[PDB]
Assembly symmetry: C2
Homo-oligomer: 458 residues x 2
């Protein structure tokens, strides 16, 4: 009957992202259908309600059930759901969005926006532009891209290669050539006894060593999230970005700021770049761009790169780059309504204020908890990393599944917080509309779940 | 105000497939599209056009379907988004998956994985082909054979699959592992070859390439049933059977790229059914939603799916996902789109009116002195312009014959595309088009072709 037939269809015909193919198909990993939501709460097919303390995947930033955004999508869909943006074609919506992103949200020196539908396709565009940039400048060898261990930049062949987490590489023959990875800037896991400043110098020196080992004239760009998202909610050490940028300047290497997660208020600033004083040449956005109301990505191109793009076109004609759905009208309309709401409600300010409250409440609650090795985060991102031996920084045996168990316990108590991959880490990325009262409720549920698992394993 | 919009556009919008400097300087003037209904669109000057290219082979049910807008709206109100990670779903994405497999895909297809573009779908394809071979213990079996003039997307990997040089130049493509065999365009065959000899030539050259590379190193072959962006090129009679026999011999997977051909465009469910192809993997987008929302699909056959299951048992969950995979509003748009394709029998209209289009273009242009070839099938057609018909000598590209014909059509209120890398006028109208509308398109094309013929002949 109805729901049972839907789950049967799901098992038989729907290949999910990031889902154990056989267990899901067999029914051992049970399906869940989401039927609605409002604010920070979602509802499933059994009528159970959950506090979504992960905002989908760091993306439902204005919260669920915004009929204002639905209306805007509808209006555009009625007027003109689609035409292409090839050979200088546009809608009013995509033009207004481009101007608004550059004028109101992007850091200084940014000029143009190129649109796709995912964070992954945006980073794909980024590498194409970096390679084109160097070819038109007469530097055919200057092509390598430096990423970082535990960075997350997407799930394709090139983009999965940028990504620094092994599950995105396994059985896909990644990373492909030209992509290198430097160190994860996680001070908690630094060589023992290193101060924060020593650790920063270590990260800068290791970057330099890698650049010199590869040949600086062969290295084109460096890509990094301001704060690492999927690699575990890892804020950089104090002074990290200034030290990295001095190395990149020395060897004439472009900085790509991956703002897929950090963009559009998530850290309590416009983007992560402004938050940390980064000066990127190229910026990747998605997620909070539309609050996931529709799929849209952006590549924000600085003046320096844009100027060379123009020159390339003068010498060689139009660049061979386009997606059919680049600048999709309904997606642009969703973004505009999303920005209106972020601005009108000052959700960047709410993220800074309530986010700091979240940071503080998690430190007070879990700072001395025997299961918790580190409490970390910034703005509206936070995490608890679970360790078997706190003082030595000895992780649990992965087979124990401490992280997933904490997450599952939260879920039983009606709260969604993610077991982050490749470690034992509980992650929080709530919608930016969250209140202090809602934070207290999330923290209390997390506390119970962490206590419960601590009893089982300690 | 219109001037202010264009100033914003020039200053801040990087378009796809647009001369960056000329557009920024104003030398390539912008165009804003404000509306459309049926086969007709409207621009910022209030000028109206017959869109004989359906956007980019994609607005298949026609413009202004408030039924689809309503469906998008309803889903957006109820739940615009949640992820589909770790077995999560909406009812819409489940219904869509079952409907694609049961009603549209060829026999033997089992699962659908969702993205947002034809390009990201082909990216997924290569991941699956590599994963498939690694889990089977064949780490060398990884090369992908594509074809000259094939179009498969505009990324690094997908642009490498693509066989048109504009998608490669200054991007260092194609990357390693990607090879290209011959374009199956009989009109441009080695001189004297009959149609059957040309098919044998294509099969033999494929086999030679496979043997030169080492068959044990070749994982897949990717092909559009009919080549779209490479010039509206239907395959020769018997081509697909001959190619498939070579693929079967060396145990090579067939990826049918149905981004254009899918969902009624040729007068069949997909190009695969039309030509009797037996793919292991299928790529869809465009006509999946009629572009009302961005959605792509990878349709996975039983054979590949079974290995995917086994891989998960041995190695855990596959590391593949996009944030927006299975996006609810996009799924709702597809469902409404399918309802309309089915209810109005647009596959049947595409077969019937498409045959009329084929016939009318051959009668009108078969002996035209500018036209070297008239080709097409179903609701795809093209005219290729040549300087010397019997010798098959193209015009000097600098003459811009194709673009000039297209521009002349446009002046007379019809959009038909000057296809890249040659002098080719392309047609891919919405599937709702009538015979009377076909006559009008052909008449405008006739005038435009005559006008340019006067200038250059
Ligand atoms: Mg060998």
């Amino acid at each position: 009957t109805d729901l049972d037939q839907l789950f049967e269809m799901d098992r038989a015909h729907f290949m999910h992202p990031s889902t154990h193919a056989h267990d899901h198909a067999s029914g051992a990993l049970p399906g869940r259908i989401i039927t609605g939501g409002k604010g920070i709460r979602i509802q499933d097919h059994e009528g159970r309600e959950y506090i979504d303390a992960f905002a989908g995947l760091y993306c439902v930033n204005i919260g669920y059930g915004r009929t204002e955004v639905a209306d805007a999508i509808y209006e555009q869909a009625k007027e003109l759901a689609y035409y292409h943006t090839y050979v200088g074609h546009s809608t009013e919506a995509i033009i207004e969005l481009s101007s608004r992103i550059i004028r109101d949200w992007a850091p200084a020196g940014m000029k143009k926006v190129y649109y796709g539908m995912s964070g992954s396709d945006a980073n794909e565009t980024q590498i194409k532009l970096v390679w084109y940039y160097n070819n038109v400048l007469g530097r055919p060898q200057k092509k390598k891209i430096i990423s970082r261990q535990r960075g997350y930049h997407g799930s394709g062949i090139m983009t999965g290669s940028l990504t620094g987490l092994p599950s995105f590489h396994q059985h896909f023959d990644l990373p492909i050539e030209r992509i290198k990875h430097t160190v994860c800037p996680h001070w908690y896991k630094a060589p023992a006894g290193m101060s924060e400043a020593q650790f920063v110098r270590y990260c800068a020196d290791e970057l330099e060593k890698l650049i010199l080992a590869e040949g600086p004239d062969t290295v084109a760009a460096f890509i990094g999230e301001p704060v690492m998202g999927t690699g575990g909610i890892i804020p950089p050490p104090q002074g990290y970005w200034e030290a990295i940028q001095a190395v990149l300047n020395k060897y004439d290497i472009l900085l790509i700021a991956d703002e897929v997660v950090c963009g559009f208020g998530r850290l309590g600033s416009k983007m992560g770049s402004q938050h940390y004083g980064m000066k990127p040449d190229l910026i990747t956005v998605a997620k909070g761009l539309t609050s996931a109301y529709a799929p849209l990505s952006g590549v924000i191109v600085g003046e320096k790169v844009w100027d060379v793009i123009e020159k390339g076109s003068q010498e060689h004609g139009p660049m061979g780059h386009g997606w059919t759905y680049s600048g999709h009208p309904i997606c642009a309309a969703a973004a505009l309504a999303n920005l209106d709401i972020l601005e009108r409600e000052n959700l960047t300010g709410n993220a800074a204020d309530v986010g700091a409250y979240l940071q503080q409440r998690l430190r007070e609650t879990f700072g001395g908890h025997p299961l918790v090795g580190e409490v970390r985060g910034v703005g509206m991102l936070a995490a608890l990393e679970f360790m078997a031996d706190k003082d030595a920084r000895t992780p649990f045996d992965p087979a124990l599944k401490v992280g997933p168990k904490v997450s599952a316990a939260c879920l039983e108590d009606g709260m969604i917080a993610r077991a982050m991959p490749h470690g034992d880490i509980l992650g929080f990325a709530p919608p930016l509309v969250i209140t202090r009262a809602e934070v207290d409720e999330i923290v209390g549920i997390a506390k119970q779940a962490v206590d419960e698992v601590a009893d089982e394993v300690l």
